């Protein structure tokens, strides 16, 4: 009941907790968090700029908290400031600023509550150097510097000791302000005592008592965690080189094995290149890895003079020796471990980000629509046939035809030899017998080697030279990619659609369904089915949730722009289950809609079929008004929502000089059918529609006017480019 | 717990290993026989530290092997139930926490955890904070425990820890 | 039945030699030293490799003198052998913590006697 019986959508599982609703006071903070968090390491969206990206993250993040609107519900479909303002169809990276702002606020609030409780307890015990509550407001105010709240926030909040009912050298603040100022303005205890004179309030006779206290105070400080941070993580060279056994154990396949001179490596080797970070992180696990800055020997030398005494007469010399010794004791713990942890975290994040960008880019570039039908589609589309077997990956000698509405619906073949090396009539006789009794429109082959290419070319010649394409017209096999039956043929759709057929028939049905609708092949699978396809070698060392979110956001954006057929998910088994990657219709809303429409005889008459029958709720139906399309409401099969129908009908009547109907009970208007555009584009100007929508409608019709004009002129038309070259890497 | 005991073993040796390297070869065969193993009697032996003596090798009648009762010193690791040990926190999960007691690992359910130590799955790091966020108990922390039940799994010890006792946390 | 809380140990284990966490560290790292200082040597087992760390985390001291002294200050008293290690690894900062942790110390000793054993142990701590 939380997926289809509530007020709207819940399928945005990457952000629906921390960023799942926006108040008024948090919208500016979340937009600032998104603009401040969205560009730290790489130059991303420097897309709109700083003010335009901060207002796109604030306006989209504050808008998604009403009605649940996200993805195809407003980002990746219009000329407005949706999120970062880039051309990408997936909004999941712009909603990351909203989720991050919400997670940072929650963490800052809990920590501020903790700081108040601890400060009150420490003050009540102190009045009835001491630890105090003064870090609680400074930590609770710094929501952007989360890692400052880890090294310094965990050093101040863990430095209290955590137990409750519920003068040794310089200070930490002065050493910090002297170390972070680049000049140590304050010295150590400039007194005629040495470092061991403060041990008399150690019990072992040791001069090392004060050095441990100074290191413990120095390593917990927010100021040192900020001062050390971003100096080496922003700029260290990726000095990775081979080990004694690693130069032989790797063999130039990883980042540490490839470069024996890599100890001079550039600072981009893990932050701009994913492969260098992935190789340095993976080679270090078994044999060894080279990851070192080499900038501390000089980054650590200039901080040694600050916080030390300038004189040496056993007063300033003891204070200077105590300051130098305490700085050396605190650097190896706090600065050493902090610098190592930042370098390691930065390398892993940079390698994972490069791998995740490569996997998301590959999935977005491959996920697009281009069915292998006749001419790319008498009637519409047709038999998108091809050989799954023969010389390719399938065993049987024959072909199967994709039915346009899904995968392959028929097949045939013949065992004639192209078999043994002495035969020349056998393969041609089998090809003629299979092509003569079946009416195709197209061909493809699931190839795997030199013999598969030869058999495809020979069958293409035997089909083209014999008129086996249409029985009065030329057509046969080629380099067109039948390999889409390789993974979809062994799937649950290919096994439930045909259970007596061999793997050659399953591969031919998979190939023919790439020839009928790869958007139905992508939407008809679970997403587990998308992760079986590799997108990069550095994606395996990355977290799989990033590639799944990138693929899911790309698939949801491509489905929201390509149109969803309402009638195509009711009767055809290969076109069903397409309501999963739509805007405001996640798995639950889509699955409930399919069950209720099949069980009740509810058909897709218009876009208000889920709003009129009480199957859907106002928020999911408003945020999903741009994705649901039907076969017949005449604006029902397009991107036109219920609020834009009147303006789009009025524009279609005004552009033709004949729309006398006021949106109902009258002649003409733009909504009469999706197959034809208006007769006059110079009649409907953008300024008149943008001025009329700002005063009657409560919204600017500037960016929406082109989409509203196009949705009335061209129904069911996809926004994403798809296809490629079958003879190059797009089919081989 | 780490103990030192005298153990014994009888090893078989094939005639190809006779000649001047013989008793060296007897030492080699034990060092790569009884190391890192576990038993339902003595428990998990970490290493053989030295060999006490070789008993004279009894030549097997019929077959050419000879067997060598070698006595040896062993550092053995046998946990008992009710012992209070230190460990490192390995994995923080809503189903339970995972620790590691040397060669032997343990696991702590939220059942054994009183309700103070709540979950933290929203955070990048899974931790067990309290309501006020003062007592931070996350992965890779030297967290004490008490062995409340032992279990041997085919030459493999698997105890179970708890958090019921006070002073079971950060030192 | 086997509960070290009530000090019940098998006959095979009663005569056993207790070991300290810091003490065994010297035995293991010396075994590492003996074998790694041998040329033509096979790699040691993953069981050896995964344990050296454990005792390292809990090294209250390395020093060969403190390996003896936390034992000698204890053996002088009328403690069990079992008590020898649990009290010398944990280093409970008070007899109260130790008596809460260890059920066998409760009523066993004066708190101040046990506290001085533990204070002598804390003053051995690196």
UniProtKB/Swiss-Prot annotation, chain A:
<feature type="modified residue" description="N6-acetyllysine">
    <location>
        <position position="357"/>
    </location>
</feature>
<feature type="region of interest" description="Interaction with KDM6A">
    <location>
        <begin position="31"/>
        <end position="732"/>
    </location>
</feature>
<comment type="subunit">
    <text>(Microbial infection) Interacts with human cytomegalovirus/HHV-5 protein UL69.</text>
</comment>
<comment type="similarity">
    <text>Belongs to the SPT6 family.</text>
</comment>
<protein>
    <recommendedName>
        <fullName>Transcription elongation factor SPT6</fullName>
    </recommendedName>
</protein>
<comment type="function">
    <text>Histone H3-H4 chaperone that plays a key role in the regulation of transcription elongation and mRNA processing. Enhances the transcription elongation by RNA polymerase II (RNAPII) and is also required for the efficient activation of transcriptional elongation by the HIV-1 nuclear transcriptional activator, Tat. Besides chaperoning histones in transcription, acts to transport and splice mRNA by forming a complex with IWS1 and the C-terminal domain (CTD) of the RNAPII subunit RPB1 (POLR2A).</text>
</comment>
<comment type="subunit">
    <text>Interacts with RNA polymerase II and the DRB sensitivity-inducing factor complex (DSIF complex), which is composed of SUPT5H and SUPT4H1. Interacts with KDM6A. Interacts (via SH2 domain) with SETD1A. Interacts (via SH2 domain) with POLR2A phosphorylated at 'Ser-2'. Interacts with IWS1, AICDA and PAAF1. Interacts with histone H2B and H3. Interacts with WDR43.</text>
</comment>
């Amino acid at each position: 009941n939380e997926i289809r019986a509530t007020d709207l959508p819940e399928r945005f599982q990457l952000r629906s907790i921390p960023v799942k609703g926006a108040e008024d006071d948090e919208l500016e903070e979340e937009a600032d968090w998104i603009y401040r968090n969205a560009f730290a390491t790489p130059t991303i969206s420097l897309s709109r700029k700083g003010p335009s990206t901060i207002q796109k993250i604030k306006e989209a993040l504050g808008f998604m908290r009403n009605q649940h609107f996200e993805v195809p519900f407003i980002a990746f479909y219009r000329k407005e400031y949706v999120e970062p303002e880039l051309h990408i169809n997936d909004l999941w990276r712009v909603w990351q600023w909203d989720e991050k702002w919400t997670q940072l606020r929650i963490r800052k609030e809990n920590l501020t509550r903790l700081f108040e409780k601890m400060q009150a307890y420490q003050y009540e015990q102190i009045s009835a150097i001491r630890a105090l509550d003064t870090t609680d407001m400074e930590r609770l105010k710094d929501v952007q510097s989360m890692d400052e709240l880890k090294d310094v926030y965990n050093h101040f909040l863990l430095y209290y000791g955590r137990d409750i009912p519920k003068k040794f050298g310089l200070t930490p603040e002065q050493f910090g302000e002297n170390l972070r100022d680049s000049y140590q303005r304050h010295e150590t205890e400039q007194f005629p005592a040495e470092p061991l004179e403060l041990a008399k309030d150690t019990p072992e006779a040791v001069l090392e008592g004060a050095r441990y206290m100074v290191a413990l105070q120095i390593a917990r400080e927010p100021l040192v965690r900020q001062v050390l941070r971003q100096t080496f993580q922003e700029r260290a060279k990726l000095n990775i080189t081979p080990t004694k056994k690693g130069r032989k154990d790797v063999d130039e396949a990883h980042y540490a094995y490839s470069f024996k001179y890599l100890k001079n490596k550039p600072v981009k080797e893990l932050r701009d290149d994913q492969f260098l970070k992935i190789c340095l992180a993976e080679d270090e696990g078994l044999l060894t890895t080279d990851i070192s800055i080499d900038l501390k020997g000089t980054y650590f030398e200039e901080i040694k003079q600050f916080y030390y005494r300038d004189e040496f007469s056993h007063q300033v010399q003891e204070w200077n020796r105590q300051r130098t010794m305490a700085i050396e004791r605190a650097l190896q713990q706090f600065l050493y471990v902090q610098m190592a942890k930042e370098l390691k975290n930065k390398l892993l994040a940079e390698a994972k980000e490069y791998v995740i960008k490569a996997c998301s880019r590959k999935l977005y570039n491959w996920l697009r629509v281009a069915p292998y039908r006749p001419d790319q589609q008498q009637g519409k589309g047709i038999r998108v046939l091809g050989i799954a077997f023969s010389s390719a990956r399938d065993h049987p000698v024959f072909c199967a035809l994709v039915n346009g509405e899904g995968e392959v619906t028929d097949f045939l073949r013949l065992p004639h030899f192209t078999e043994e090396r002495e035969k020349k009539a056998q393969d041609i006789e089998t090809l003629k017998k299979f092509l003569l009794n079946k009416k195709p429109h197209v061909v493809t082959v699931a190839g795997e080697n030199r013999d598969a290419q030869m058999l495809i070319e020979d069958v293409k010649r035997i089909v083209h030279e014999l008129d086996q394409g249409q029985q009065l017209s030329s057509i046969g096999v080629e380099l067109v990619d039948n390999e889409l039956a390789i993974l979809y043929m062994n799937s649950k759709k290919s096994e439930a659609e045909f259970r007596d057929y061999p793997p050659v028939l399953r591969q031919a049905v998979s190939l023919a369904r790439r020839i009928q609708d790869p958007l139905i092949e992508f939407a008809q699978v679970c997403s587990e089915d998308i992760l079986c396809l590799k997108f990069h070698p550095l994606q395996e060392h990355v977290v799989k949730e990033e590639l799944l979110n990138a693929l899911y956001c790309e698939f949801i954006n491509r489905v929201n722009e390509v149109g969803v057929d309402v009638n195509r998910a009711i009767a055809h088994p290969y076109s069903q289950a397409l309501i999963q990657y739509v805007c405001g219709l996640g798995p639950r809303k889509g699955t409930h809609l399919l069950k209720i429409l099949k069980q009740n005889n509810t058909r897709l008459e218009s876009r208000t079929q889920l709003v009129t029958m009480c199957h859907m709720g106002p928020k999911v139906f408003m945020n999903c008004a741009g994705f649901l399309k039907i076969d017949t409401e005449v604006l029902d099969g397009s991107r036109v929502h219920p609020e834009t129908y009147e303006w789009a009908r009025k524009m279609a009547v005004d552009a033709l000089e004949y729309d006398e109907s006021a949106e109902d009970a009258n002649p003409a208007g733009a909504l009469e059918e999706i197959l034809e555009n208006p007769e006059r584009l110079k009649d409907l100007d953008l300024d008149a529609f943008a001025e009329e929508l700002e005063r009657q409608g409560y919204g600017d019709k500037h960016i929406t006017l082109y989409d509203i004009r196009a949705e009335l002129s061209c129904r069911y038309k996809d926004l994403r480019t798809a296809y490629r070259s079958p003879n190059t890497e797009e089919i081989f | 717990m780490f103990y030192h005991i005298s153990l014994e073993h009888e090893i078989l040796l094939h005639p190809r290993y006779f000649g001047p390297n013989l008793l060296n070869t007897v030492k080699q065969k034990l060092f790569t026989e009884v190391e890192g193993t576990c038993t339902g009697k003595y428990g998990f032996v970490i290493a053989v530290t030295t060999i006490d003596n070789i008993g004279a090798g009894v030549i097997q009648p019929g077959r050419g092997f000879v067997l060598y009762p070698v006595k040896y010193k062993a550092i053995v690791f046998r946990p008992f139930k009710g012992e209070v040990v230190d460990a490192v926190v390995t994995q923080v999960n809503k189903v339970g926490l995972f620790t590691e007691i040397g060669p032997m690992s343990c696991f702590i359910s939220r059942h054994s955890i009183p309700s103070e130590m709540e979950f933290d799955p929203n955070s990048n790091p899974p931790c067990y904070k309290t309501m006020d966020e003062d007592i931070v108990i996350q992965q890779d922390d030297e967290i004490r425990l008490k062995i409340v039940g032992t279990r041997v799994d085919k030459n493999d010890i698997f105890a179970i820890g708890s958090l019921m006792d006070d002073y079971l946390g950060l030192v | 039945e086997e509960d070290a809380s009530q000090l019940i140990f098998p006959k095979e284990f009663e005569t056993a030699e207790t070991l300290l966490n810091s003490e065994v560290h010297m035995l293991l790292e010396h075994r590492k030293q003996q074998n790694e200082s041998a040329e033509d040597e096979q790699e040691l087992s993953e069981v050896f490799m995964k344990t050296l760390n454990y005792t390292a985390r809990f090294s209250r001291f390395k020093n060969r003198e403190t390996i003896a002294s936390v034992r000698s200050l204890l053996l002088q008293k009328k403690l069990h052998k079992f008590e020898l290690a649990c009290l010398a690894n944990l280093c409970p900062e008070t007899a109260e913590e130790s008596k809460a942790l260890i059920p066998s110390l409760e009523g066993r000793f004066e708190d101040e006697e046990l506290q001085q054993i533990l204070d002598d142990i804390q003053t051995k701590r690196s």
